[PDB]
Amino acid sequence: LKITRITVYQVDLPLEHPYWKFELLDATLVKLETDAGITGWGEGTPWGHTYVPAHGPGIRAGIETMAPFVLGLDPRRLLDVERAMDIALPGHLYAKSPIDMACWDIAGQAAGLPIADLMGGGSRTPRPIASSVGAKSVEETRAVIDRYRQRGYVAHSVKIGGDVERDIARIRDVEDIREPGEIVLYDVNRGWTRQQALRVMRATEDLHVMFEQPGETLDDIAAIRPLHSAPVSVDECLVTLQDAARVARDGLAEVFGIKLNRVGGLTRAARMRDIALTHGIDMFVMATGGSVLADAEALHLAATIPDHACHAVWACQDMLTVDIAGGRGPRNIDGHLHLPETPGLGVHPDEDALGDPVAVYSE
Amino acid sequence: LKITRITVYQVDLPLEHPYWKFELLDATLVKLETDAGITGWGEGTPWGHTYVPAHGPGIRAGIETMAPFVLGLDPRRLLDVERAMDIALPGHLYAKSPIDMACWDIAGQAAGLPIADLMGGGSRTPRPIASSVGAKSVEETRAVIDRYRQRGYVAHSVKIGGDVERDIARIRDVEDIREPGEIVLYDVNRGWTRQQALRVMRATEDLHVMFEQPGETLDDIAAIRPLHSAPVSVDECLVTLQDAARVARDGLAEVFGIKLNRVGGLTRAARMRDIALTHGIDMFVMATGGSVLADAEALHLAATIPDHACHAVWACQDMLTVDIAGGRGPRNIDGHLHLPETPGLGVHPDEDALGDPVAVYSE
Amino acid sequence: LKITRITVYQVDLPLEHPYWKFELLDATLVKLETDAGITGWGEGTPWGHTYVPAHGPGIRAGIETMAPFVLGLDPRRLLDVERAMDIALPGHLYAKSPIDMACWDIAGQAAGLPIADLMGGGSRTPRPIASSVGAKSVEETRAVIDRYRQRGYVAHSVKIGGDVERDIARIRDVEDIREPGEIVLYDVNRGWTRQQALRVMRATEDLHVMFEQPGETLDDIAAIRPLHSAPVSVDECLVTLQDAARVARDGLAEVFGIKLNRVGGLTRAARMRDIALTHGIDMFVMATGGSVLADAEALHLAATIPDHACHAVWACQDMLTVDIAGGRGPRNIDGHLHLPETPGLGVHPDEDALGDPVAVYSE
Amino acid sequence: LKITRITVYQVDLPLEHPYWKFELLDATLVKLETDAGITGWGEGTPWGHTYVPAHGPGIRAGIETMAPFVLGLDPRRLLDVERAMDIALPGHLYAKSPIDMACWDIAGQAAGLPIADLMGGGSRTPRPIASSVGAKSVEETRAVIDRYRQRGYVAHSVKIGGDVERDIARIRDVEDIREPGEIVLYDVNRGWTRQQALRVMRATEDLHVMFEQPGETLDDIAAIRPLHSAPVSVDECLVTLQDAARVARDGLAEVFGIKLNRVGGLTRAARMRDIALTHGIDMFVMATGGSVLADAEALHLAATIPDHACHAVWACQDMLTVDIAGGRGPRNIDGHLHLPETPGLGVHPDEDALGDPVAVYSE
Amino acid sequence: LKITRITVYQVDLPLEHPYWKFELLDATLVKLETDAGITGWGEGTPWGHTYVPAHGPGIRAGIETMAPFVLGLDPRRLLDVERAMDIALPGHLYAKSPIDMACWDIAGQAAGLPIADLMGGGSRTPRPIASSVGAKSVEETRAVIDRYRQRGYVAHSVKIGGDVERDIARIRDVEDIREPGEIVLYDVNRGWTRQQALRVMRATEDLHVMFEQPGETLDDIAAIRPLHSAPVSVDECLVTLQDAARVARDGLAEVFGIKLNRVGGLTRAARMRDIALTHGIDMFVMATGGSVLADAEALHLAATIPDHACHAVWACQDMLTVDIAGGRGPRNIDGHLHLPETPGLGVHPDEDALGDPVAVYSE
């Protein structure tokens, strides 16, 4: 078996609810072909080009340079694919993720196994979905949660940052209406200075709350680590396996917020899982952004984690106004994603919605 | 003096109150014989084969390999017995414990001294017994404590883990009905992730409570050490003397939860005592599981600790539906164990209840 | 697919050259059967019962307890097999290795892939074999190396320990006759005190030599780490993934000496590889002991390491006087092992040489 | 003043001496235009796409995303340009460098000052040039140095890696023919494992030699830091200011090997200079690769360093077979670069050699 | 059993070879009596009153205060004796040693066991004796060693300190005439400043030598620990078990130089042994000073150490011109002490040589 052709696609996935000027995701899809005629897909969709060092053009760019060295290889040999990509172009993990996704998918089907199972075996327990709650008054806030809670959602990610007085107020408000067994994570998105982080994280310890990325960098996360007692989840700065092992040996945070595109995809999120699980660290697993092909990938990973150790996943498809698989793939069935039983990724798109190839690489 | 024959027994000790499928303890008894005709007994009884790296078949197994090198030696020379077992088979301390128990017992009688006295001198202060409180509603909870409290029990081990919201609630409930001078330890049994540990241990600092094994491994215990202020007792991961000295030099926990079978028996629990006492660390001493021969061993050790530094012992015999000594040995006399005055262990079983030898090793 | 029957075998593999009273390896073979009728094998063979916490009876023992929970599962789901074994019986990795070996082998064939390839893709570069050089005068020493060097061997493991003056002399002698490009590792086998280690490791820095396990425990390895400059390879004390990540984050040693049975087999050696490779650490990969089924397993792992990062493997079959596969499996073809191209382990024994089953576990 | 148009160019600069398949540099040139009609240039030229996380297509890619936010700004306000690029697209410093180069150049001329002077004032002391010495026998080695030494070169960068025995030999050979006052740096380019690094760096301490990037990552550099005494220069892993301040506070290396494109250009190399100089750390300053516009930029920085603290620069133009400025700009005048006296960068190319614009961004 | 009377003696033991004004040891002997009429002896003999915080009058003083609380107790209960002495008078371990010696001796005989055996079992391997080599020219030096070497001595303690140039010279001289398998320790006796220690310890690493107490305090030993590679033995500053565990966890020295009177006698040297042995640390065991009752005590301890881990003992009796046991007790039989086979200490003095009681304490 061998890789015969990489074909690259570009799709604008518009958002159901635009914001403030954010309006649509630049999404890159990859499709590798094999001489056996077993085909696999991968998707790379940064949530914008401001949130993290990754952008649409930059992946599409990555593949151009990386393509010639990935063609020819055996797709079912992910350490060889990986070592070829790494040699070919160090770093740039957001560019290596969709290829790795595709490659797994091929090997999945070739072994006649769903990704999660081929990666060692995955759980069928329905996985909760993290909602999304943008800035809004204490009044408009409760609104989105109760509405979201009627739509079956049982896990929420409330966005905060900017203002200590206002942020403390927001956490205290949300923790005032939060029915028992309700999962809420307070996602800061680096929107806090050390001094701010320290302040609000301390202020709300008596509500026993969790925070994601309370600082610009893992070093800010670390500096203030010994200063407060709130469990911190380490997200945008959780990039390599060194960041991985360093958090856990040195007790710098308690939770990994994995995001597949960010960390370089399946094979290398696997190793962060291996570490987190031996050092007693809990995960949230979500694709960075994208269609259902993104949710599918994050689900195969969330599956390989025992359910006590995996708090919530995300469905970015419910955030989008377009659908590129006409219903196919793991969808929001009552606030939860159910692992697909189908060999490989278990969802391919129809090339009807992808537009013409933006580039092609063969042998 | 010399060891002439090791004889190995196997006994199912059923539980008074089974649970959820736990129902009986696989227990290994050892009986060494000497050319002077002075006989000693040892018992090895893991609480199951899931709680800790130890199992019935594995001890019985250990002895087979270890036997030929222990035969012949002088039972009263515990550093020689020990060094022979260690050379013979590194690690496997749960397998070395019953032999060490027996050997002490022989030397005890040969010196005409109860274990506790021969080990340096033991206290006659009646030692409190830790009860056992399984998962149950806040309602069924109070029930077991008041009932247990009528039966004279004055020290309780409340089991928690799994759920931060529910666990906080359980501690707050139990600390709501706890009459002054009542000893309660909250035993987690590793049933917490770092993130969970940190959360509940912080949440309940204003009740001044103690926790046992709040994490999978001493490293999880350590990582979160600087993050909260609750005194932690270090249990399943307290195995060697290196774990011993490392906790105490590096201030990783405040309490040793010794369990004799786990740590390799009397001689090597002694050294953890030596350390804890010079570094201001308090002990709970209990056999891992078993009949009265197990409680006896843990009592000889709890005795060698000054009473301010020894919070509670355990009587596993009150947990069992069978009795293999027809009343003999230290029993629950009003919530407390009284150190036996008899030379050696001060309780032998009657081989009536042990069944036929499962194996024998002579010269 | 599912596991239908575990069958356990016991074989005495005698040594070509006995020593001082070491004469034969107690070896445990396991054979799992599936309802698809796809069969896999695993082997567990400690080099004795003195070298490391592992012994024949103790594995055979482990399986008894562990068996009921492993039956029924899907062999191709190694994180599920693993989590079932771990829950079933914590620790005891030397007992979990042969089952994991077998399980991989089934999944290997079921995916129609040799182990090394299914684990991510393996190298075909012929791998050097570590010879073995027991204590002997400077004269009898050179003898074994030149003789061994004629037989095509190009990598040697010279055993030292006990005496600083004599050990320094031995290294200086061996480094005096060592033709360029010759790989020699000086294996101490914990046979040094801190004070001795420090002394000889310093004394021979100007020969640029490497040492394996220069101390009883990783803590002795660590204490003296900052005191000398010789690269140390971390072996018997390299057990869990915590030991793994702790060495590498804290720069305590530079080389992993993996031994499959010790660390718990393929799935969990994989993770040590993942770590070593991201933290710039080099490996030696060898089975702990055994027949060709042991060499095969270590080869599938040595294969998944890029060749600059894998110094040498071992063939224990050339050390044995019996052959349980009548020629089949990776053998010493001119000082080197060549990765087998066959699906799975790529070598099964003939049950002719294994004797009658020592125990059987079905459903 | 404001930025009116960014125009992007792409040029293949072939090498005078190709190697092993490396043959030409993919180089990106940028030209910003202002409403005052003051024009500036920047160049981004990774030495390939394998040496470091940077590639031609990836910069050209970066600008596309980054362009709209850089248009409009005042070029003379580098903290505003920078904060706009950073917000626009985090990380990707190799993409931000040429824009920053250009922007400085405009502000340079607008202030009527050469870059080095506007950045605080630059030295006129002729700066030595680092030669380049590829792998070759001890014989072909001496050849390149003496030949290079006749051509006036007085500073050499000898490439090593791969093999401890061969590398030690290479250093000892080169240090055998090295006339007093001759600057040689041994550049490893990450081509060493921890174990190898430690070995050769120790082996050659008595020659008092310096090494560049002896390991894959700053963590490998750090782990082995306390283990040897050779001064290490920190290169490919010297990326952000955190890497900057962390090396120096924690004494992890003694020398910064700045490379402008890598670190994000002038403004942010300036800060590494500020740090190195207050913590007693010495620099080598070179462009990553490129034409004379690259050498010019590195010279303006090497100038802002006092001459005792700046060991050597590099002229990549002497490595190239094409010339895109027909003689203009700082050239190799007898082994040394002389800081240009002209306002701004002090060298623009002629758009004759750049080919047609590969993209244009206006308002 | 119980203690009935403590009787205290004072004896001047003159030296065979006086020095420079040192001439005789002020020695305190203690004799406890029991109602069973089983009698035990202890001796406390600082080597002067300048070498260490201990002096004749100060022990005799200690007992006065400590006596009333030690009378009455059971001598065979050393943790009770110890806890009574500690409560009675904290610190002052040089005063608590002779009582502890005596007490062991009683319990020894009462158990019908020699000290070494009752403490867990002792080795019969003849133990080497450390000679003593005072300051002298390189010429007079060799003299004392060869003469001493004819008298059967095979282990020497060469005294150094004061002068780096002269000390380096002395080590190099002694290491020039030192026949293979000859044990020499270079004892500094704190006679070095940090700067001096560092200098000479580095200067002589290529002779692979060991040093005792190279500094005033364990902190000086520690400060310079990471700066050199010579194995250091930790002596006068090795006082409590905290010093004990702190050296070994933090890798501050490699060798314990136990001295019984200093550390508080048998029970508490035992614990330092327990620690040293689990952390791979080697011992020298000697009484601080005194007659054969001192050598006997140190031998019972040196015996409880496996012979690879015990480099040499000392016989202070060969240093004395008087003999208080008319030949009885472990004497220098050809450079070695042989463990006595007799119950208890296995040597009592005859009260003929002790003079009249200097004080008596009864009930």
Side-chain angles (χ1 to χ4, degrees), chain D residues 313-328:
Chain D
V313 187
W314 182 44
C316 186
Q317 255 292 166
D318 288 78
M319 298 275 285
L320 302 176
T321 218
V322 151
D323 173 344
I324 58 159
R328 299 188 308 266

PDB file of all heavy atoms in Angstrom, chain D residues 313-328:
ATOM      1  N   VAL D 313      29.850  37.836  11.928  1.00  0.00           N
ATOM      2  CA  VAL D 313      28.643  37.950  11.147  1.00  0.00           C
ATOM      3  C   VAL D 313      28.765  36.940  10.022  1.00  0.00           C
ATOM      4  O   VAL D 313      29.663  36.102  10.027  1.00  0.00           O
ATOM      5  CB  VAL D 313      28.485  39.369  10.575  1.00  0.00           C
ATOM      6  CG1 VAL D 313      27.110  39.546   9.893  1.00  0.00           C
ATOM      7  CG2 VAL D 313      28.616  40.375  11.660  1.00  0.00           C
ATOM      8  N   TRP D 314      27.867  37.026   9.052  1.00  0.00           N
ATOM      9  CA  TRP D 314      27.891  36.157   7.897  1.00  0.00           C
ATOM     10  C   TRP D 314      27.474  36.939   6.654  1.00  0.00           C
ATOM     11  O   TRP D 314      26.611  37.830   6.715  1.00  0.00           O
ATOM     12  CB  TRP D 314      26.956  34.969   8.139  1.00  0.00           C
ATOM     13  CG  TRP D 314      26.894  33.928   7.048  1.00  0.00           C
ATOM     14  CD1 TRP D 314      27.953  33.382   6.351  1.00  0.00           C
ATOM     15  CD2 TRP D 314      25.714  33.259   6.566  1.00  0.00           C
ATOM     16  NE1 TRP D 314      27.494  32.433   5.463  1.00  0.00           N
ATOM     17  CE2 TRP D 314      26.126  32.338   5.576  1.00  0.00           C
ATOM     18  CE3 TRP D 314      24.351  33.351   6.876  1.00  0.00           C
ATOM     19  CZ2 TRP D 314      25.221  31.526   4.894  1.00  0.00           C
ATOM     20  CZ3 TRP D 314      23.463  32.548   6.200  1.00  0.00           C
ATOM     21  CH2 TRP D 314      23.898  31.649   5.222  1.00  0.00           C
ATOM     22  N   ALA D 315      28.117  36.599   5.540  1.00  0.00           N
ATOM     23  CA  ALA D 315      27.767  37.098   4.222  1.00  0.00           C
ATOM     24  C   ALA D 315      27.300  35.928   3.357  1.00  0.00           C
ATOM     25  O   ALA D 315      28.106  35.127   2.880  1.00  0.00           O
ATOM     26  CB  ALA D 315      28.954  37.808   3.597  1.00  0.00           C
ATOM     27  N   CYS D 316      25.987  35.819   3.195  1.00  0.00           N
ATOM     28  CA  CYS D 316      25.379  34.726   2.440  1.00  0.00           C
ATOM     29  C   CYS D 316      25.492  35.014   0.941  1.00  0.00           C
ATOM     30  O   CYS D 316      25.372  34.112   0.108  1.00  0.00           O
ATOM     31  CB  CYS D 316      23.906  34.536   2.855  1.00  0.00           C
ATOM     32  SG  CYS D 316      23.012  33.095   2.139  1.00  0.00           S
ATOM     33  N   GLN D 317      25.728  36.277   0.602  1.00  0.00           N
ATOM     34  CA  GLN D 317      25.919  36.652  -0.785  1.00  0.00           C
ATOM     35  C   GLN D 317      27.126  35.971  -1.419  1.00  0.00           C
ATOM     36  O   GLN D 317      27.056  35.556  -2.567  1.00  0.00           O
ATOM     37  CB  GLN D 317      26.003  38.168  -0.953  1.00  0.00           C
ATOM     38  CG  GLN D 317      24.746  38.780  -1.551  1.00  0.00           C
ATOM     39  CD  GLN D 317      24.506  38.388  -3.001  1.00  0.00           C
ATOM     40  OE1 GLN D 317      23.423  38.597  -3.527  1.00  0.00           O
ATOM     41  NE2 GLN D 317      25.526  37.835  -3.657  1.00  0.00           N
ATOM     42  N   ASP D 318      28.219  35.831  -0.683  1.00  0.00           N
ATOM     43  CA  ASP D 318      29.363  35.096  -1.199  1.00  0.00           C
ATOM     44  C   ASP D 318      29.084  33.600  -1.423  1.00  0.00           C
ATOM     45  O   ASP D 318      29.902  32.883  -2.020  1.00  0.00           O
ATOM     46  CB  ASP D 318      30.570  35.305  -0.295  1.00  0.00           C
ATOM     47  CG  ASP D 318      31.130  36.691  -0.420  1.00  0.00           C
ATOM     48  OD1 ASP D 318      30.536  37.613   0.179  1.00  0.00           O
ATOM     49  OD2 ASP D 318      32.135  36.873  -1.153  1.00  0.00           O
ATOM     50  N   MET D 319      27.931  33.138  -0.943  1.00  0.00           N
ATOM     51  CA  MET D 319      27.525  31.735  -1.057  1.00  0.00           C
ATOM     52  C   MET D 319      26.631  31.522  -2.285  1.00  0.00           C
ATOM     53  O   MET D 319      26.304  30.387  -2.645  1.00  0.00           O
ATOM     54  CB  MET D 319      26.770  31.310   0.207  1.00  0.00           C
ATOM     55  CG  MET D 319      27.582  31.390   1.487  1.00  0.00           C
ATOM     56  SD  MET D 319      28.548  29.899   1.732  1.00  0.00           S
ATOM     57  CE  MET D 319      27.277  28.763   2.258  1.00  0.00           C
ATOM     58  N   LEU D 320      26.243  32.628  -2.911  1.00  0.00           N
ATOM     59  CA  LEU D 320      25.273  32.630  -3.991  1.00  0.00           C
ATOM     60  C   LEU D 320      25.902  32.933  -5.339  1.00  0.00           C
ATOM     61  O   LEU D 320      26.872  33.670  -5.439  1.00  0.00           O
ATOM     62  CB  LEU D 320      24.187  33.674  -3.727  1.00  0.00           C
ATOM     63  CG  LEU D 320      23.348  33.605  -2.463  1.00  0.00           C
ATOM     64  CD1 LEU D 320      22.437  34.820  -2.416  1.00  0.00           C
ATOM     65  CD2 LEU D 320      22.542  32.327  -2.401  1.00  0.00           C
ATOM     66  N   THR D 321      25.294  32.398  -6.385  1.00  0.00           N
ATOM     67  CA  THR D 321      25.831  32.494  -7.727  1.00  0.00           C
ATOM     68  C   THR D 321      25.217  33.662  -8.501  1.00  0.00           C
ATOM     69  O   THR D 321      25.745  34.067  -9.536  1.00  0.00           O
ATOM     70  CB  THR D 321      25.647  31.142  -8.469  1.00  0.00           C
ATOM     71  OG1 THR D 321      26.793  30.886  -9.289  1.00  0.00           O
ATOM     72  CG2 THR D 321      24.348  31.110  -9.295  1.00  0.00           C
ATOM     73  N   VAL D 322      24.116  34.203  -7.981  1.00  0.00           N
ATOM     74  CA  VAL D 322      23.423  35.346  -8.572  1.00  0.00           C
ATOM     75  C   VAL D 322      23.725  36.558  -7.704  1.00  0.00           C
ATOM     76  O   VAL D 322      24.062  36.398  -6.539  1.00  0.00           O
ATOM     77  CB  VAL D 322      21.884  35.070  -8.655  1.00  0.00           C
ATOM     78  CG1 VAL D 322      21.058  36.349  -8.581  1.00  0.00           C
ATOM     79  CG2 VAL D 322      21.541  34.290  -9.924  1.00  0.00           C
ATOM     80  N   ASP D 323      23.620  37.762  -8.274  1.00  0.00           N
ATOM     81  CA  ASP D 323      23.706  39.024  -7.508  1.00  0.00           C
ATOM     82  C   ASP D 323      22.541  39.988  -7.867  1.00  0.00           C
ATOM     83  O   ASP D 323      22.456  40.458  -8.999  1.00  0.00           O
ATOM     84  CB  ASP D 323      25.092  39.666  -7.718  1.00  0.00           C
ATOM     85  CG  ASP D 323      25.213  41.064  -7.109  1.00  0.00           C
ATOM     86  OD1 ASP D 323      24.191  41.690  -6.779  1.00  0.00           O
ATOM     87  OD2 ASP D 323      26.354  41.552  -6.984  1.00  0.00           O
ATOM     88  N   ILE D 324      21.663  40.281  -6.902  1.00  0.00           N
ATOM     89  CA  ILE D 324      20.466  41.097  -7.169  1.00  0.00           C
ATOM     90  C   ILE D 324      20.583  42.594  -6.866  1.00  0.00           C
ATOM     91  O   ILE D 324      19.570  43.304  -6.862  1.00  0.00           O
ATOM     92  CB  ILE D 324      19.182  40.552  -6.479  1.00  0.00           C
ATOM     93  CG1 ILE D 324      19.363  40.449  -4.966  1.00  0.00           C
ATOM     94  CG2 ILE D 324      18.741  39.218  -7.085  1.00  0.00           C
ATOM     95  CD1 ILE D 324      18.058  40.417  -4.222  1.00  0.00           C
ATOM     96  N   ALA D 325      21.798  43.078  -6.620  1.00  0.00           N
ATOM     97  CA  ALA D 325      22.032  44.511  -6.414  1.00  0.00           C
ATOM     98  C   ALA D 325      23.222  45.102  -7.233  1.00  0.00           C
ATOM     99  O   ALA D 325      23.711  46.217  -6.957  1.00  0.00           O
ATOM    100  CB  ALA D 325      22.184  44.800  -4.923  1.00  0.00           C
ATOM    101  N   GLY D 326      23.669  44.354  -8.243  1.00  0.00           N
ATOM    102  CA  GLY D 326      24.839  44.712  -9.051  1.00  0.00           C
ATOM    103  C   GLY D 326      25.981  45.369  -8.292  1.00  0.00           C
ATOM    104  O   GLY D 326      26.454  46.429  -8.691  1.00  0.00           O
ATOM    105  N   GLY D 327      26.414  44.751  -7.196  1.00  0.00           N
ATOM    106  CA  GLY D 327      27.527  45.289  -6.404  1.00  0.00           C
ATOM    107  C   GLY D 327      27.167  46.124  -5.178  1.00  0.00           C
ATOM    108  O   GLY D 327      27.979  46.266  -4.254  1.00  0.00           O
ATOM    109  N   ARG D 328      25.956  46.675  -5.144  1.00  0.00           N
ATOM    110  CA  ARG D 328      25.576  47.557  -4.050  1.00  0.00           C
ATOM    111  C   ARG D 328      25.368  46.812  -2.721  1.00  0.00           C
ATOM    112  O   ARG D 328      25.055  45.623  -2.712  1.00  0.00           O
ATOM    113  CB  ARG D 328      24.332  48.344  -4.425  1.00  0.00           C
ATOM    114  CG  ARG D 328      24.505  49.245  -5.640  1.00  0.00           C
ATOM    115  CD  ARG D 328      23.283  50.124  -5.808  1.00  0.00           C
ATOM    116  NE  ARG D 328      22.064  49.318  -5.810  1.00  0.00           N
ATOM    117  CZ  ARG D 328      21.475  48.867  -6.909  1.00  0.00           C
ATOM    118  NH1 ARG D 328      21.993  49.161  -8.090  1.00  0.00           N
ATOM    119  NH2 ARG D 328      20.374  48.129  -6.832  1.00  0.00           N
TER     120      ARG D 328
END
